[PDB]
Amino acid sequence: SLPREDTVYIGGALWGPATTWNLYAPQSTWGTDQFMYLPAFQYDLGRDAWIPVIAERYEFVDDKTLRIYIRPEARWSDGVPITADDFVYALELTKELGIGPGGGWDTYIEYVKAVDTKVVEFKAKEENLNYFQFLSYSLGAQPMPKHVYERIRAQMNIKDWINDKPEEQVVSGPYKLYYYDPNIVVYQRVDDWWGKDIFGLPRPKYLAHVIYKDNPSASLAFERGDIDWNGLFIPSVWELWEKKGLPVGTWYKKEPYFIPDGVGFVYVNNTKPGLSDPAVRKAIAYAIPYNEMLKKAYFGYGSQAHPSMVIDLFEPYKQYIDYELAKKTFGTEDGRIPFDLDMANKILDEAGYKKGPDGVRVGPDGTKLGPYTISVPYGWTDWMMMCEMIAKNLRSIGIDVKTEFPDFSVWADRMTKGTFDLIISWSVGPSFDHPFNIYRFVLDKRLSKPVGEVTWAGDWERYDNDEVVELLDKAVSTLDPEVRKQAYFRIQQIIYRDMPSIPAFYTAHWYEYSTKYWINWPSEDNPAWFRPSPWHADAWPTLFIISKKSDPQPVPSWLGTVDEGGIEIPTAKIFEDLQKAT
Ligand SMILES: OC[C@H]1O[C@@H](O[C@@H]2[C@@H](O)[C@H](O)O[C@H](CO)[C@H]2O)[C@H](O)[C@@H](O)[C@@H]1O
Ligand SMILES: [Ca+2]
Description:
Dipeptide-binding Protein, domain 3, binds calcium ion, globular, alpha+beta, metal ion binding, seven-stranded mixed beta sheet, binds a molecule of 2 linked components (BGC-BGC), monomer, 582 residues, D-Maltodextrin-Binding Protein, domain 2, Dipeptide-binding Protein, domain 1
């Protein structure tokens, strides 16, 4: 039924059934945040710049008070202007509900205020001044249609609202839900999208995502032409074009094939007995067969993460790693953790864990390091294999771990509510504020929630440490790189001592394309957007760059910095402005 050449078929982004289209619900559906709701400004990792999207510009009143001016054209899909009240509303709702976009804003933002119809003002909290979070929450604030949400709240609990009626859906992005059922989710373009004159219309009229049960079935679909825009783990992906001559590609045409997405962790629930012991978590770190698993199970699509949680694939981040502490701690040339069952057993022995007759460790207090599961979603075959290789090694050191692979939604439920034992999951990636972002996401108790309550915002492992809080509250009280640095280095000491969870590998930014119906995909040859994976939070510009094969169109002129004749503002220009307002 869908017009094939006017539709982008997608894979690897939606796993399990659709849920809601409500970022305030416990779970929501792929596409909701990506395409339905846009921010004031879109961070562009590729260029280290910011696209003014819903906002046309900012002004620092002073260094702690930022005003953001909404484009006059910015307008919800129902014709109601997007206004400052929508910005205030979205954030206040998140604080009230304990869930929603911009979780944690109130920790570092003193107030968000609508100073006029199209003018929002954000003010940094000065007690725990943090310029990075001040900028992050404000520039990337996503408004929500207050006039919509208020009426829902009159009628039911917000957290229960589904938002699944297409004709009632009210969005800021260029797409909204068209149709769904147990086997597919489909979005349709908003042809009179407010952003049409500034940004153009995205070329696909439809985004469709057939719900595949597992990797092999999605891959088969991709091999046969049925997926244009894929975000999948695929084994030996190069074979698709090198051997099978299919019209498909990836970012790179040779080894890594994928750019990095972020840091994949073996998360260890700190609230469970045994797993609550830093010694046990440290022993787990030495028992991960990093290289063999990344080579065999991950196909070299990504490499071992540094234990500082800093993504050292990028030269600019390396200054934030205390290499002398890491090398001294782990005895390796760059300070990575070696796979070493001897050390793993040694750590366990020197903490007084002793194998019982069944081979499973018991601690000096009688805690058995056993039955635990390590879990990832069913059908995520790369992660499943990695789980099996990890679980085998843990068992041999007397930590009784078995794999379990439930439906994505079940897995997500246990992850977010902190009822898992071990999992592999994601965290965050390269960003203007990186390494801060990952410490904030993984280690900060203030973004967690009690066991049994959902968090998407951070610290699934329920790590609890007041010192980290204090260091995050201090790390960017001034813009002096050296101050960040020292806070980062101290957090690193704490990480090596507590091993809150294990940074294991750099996740791949899964991204594959077919040129059968759509061309001008972003790639190393055509590096127009650096987050093109269909599931990425920041995927949307990809849809403005591709063209129908039957009608090639040039790359949008708004891409590129201001000095290149685009509309994007360098991060350096924003800090220059911040500085200048001091
Ligand atoms: O590599 C693990 C699996 O990753 C899947 O993509 C994930 C997205 O759907 C998810 O929501 O975001 C994470 C961030 O790490 C992605 O890894 C692939 O679709 C699967 O094929 C793959 O096995
Ligand atoms: Ca969004």
